[PDB]
Amino acid sequence: GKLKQRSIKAEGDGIVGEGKALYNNEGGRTFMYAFISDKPDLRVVKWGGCNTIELEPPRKFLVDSPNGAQIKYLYFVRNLNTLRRGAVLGYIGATV
Amino acid sequence: GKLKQRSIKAEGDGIVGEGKALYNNEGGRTFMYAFISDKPDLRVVKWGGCNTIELEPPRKFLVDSPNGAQIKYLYFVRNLNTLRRGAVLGYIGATV
């Protein structure tokens, strides 16, 4: 549950937008957990190894910047196990 | 996703000891998620009316400090759902 974040950019059929990729490597080898962006409607992140990484429909949430609360969008990678889903949320609402 | 904590005290068939409880209130009804001591072998935490919280056999883990590094023990309340389990670990490795 000790987790790392990266700026990467993403694609919607639309559409493109920057964001926050939270991910983890093991041992050893690397795999991304969730994506957090300013904008809805994204479908994919491009990730050795170039990877096609597909997101779930985002789950929206409020967050507090000193320029008004902005709304952020949270995209889990497909078929993430509930456990790591949890881990995400855990970390998320933990950045305060 | 959002957790809050509290110093509380715990019992075991052996004896007694102290630590930090990770909990999150249902609104406004308060829910205990897991317990982090410094000692193994604890089985219960009494609880907004008092209550019996059964602990799971603790999961050892490692953390730094001014006295060196430290063996910590983390006890999940019995029958937690996997989603909340993950949230804990998320919070856990977040707090740094």
Which of B22, B68, B1, B65 minimizes the C-alpha distance to A36?
B1
What structural domains does chain B harbor? 3-96 (2.40.10.250)
CA distance A3 to A23: 7
What letters, b where the CB count within 10 A reaches 16 and e where it falls short, cover B17-53? Answer: bebbbbbbeeeeeeebbbbbbebeebbebeeeeeeeb
Please state, in angstroms and rounded to a whole number, the distance separating the CA atoms of residues B20 and B22.
7
* Nearest residue to A55 via CA among A71, A42, A73, A37: A42
Chain A hits for B2, CB-CB cut-off 8 Å, are 93
Q: Structure solved using which method?
A: X-ray
Resolution stated for this PDB structure, in Å: 2.9
Look up residue A55 and give its DSSP letter: B
Cα–Cα nearest to A47, from A29, A32, A26, A27:
A32
- Tell me how close the Cα of B42 comes to any Cα of chain A, in angstroms: 23
* CA neighbor of A91 nearest in space, from B92, B14, B10: B92
Residues 65-94 of chain B with CB under 8 A from chain A are 82-94
Which residues in chain B are contacts of A93 at CB distance < 8 A? 1-3
Chains A and B form CB pairs within 8 A to the count of 68
Residues sharing a CB contact under 8 Å with residue B29, sequence separation 6 or more, in sequence order: none
In the beta sheet, which residues pair with residue A21? A6, A35
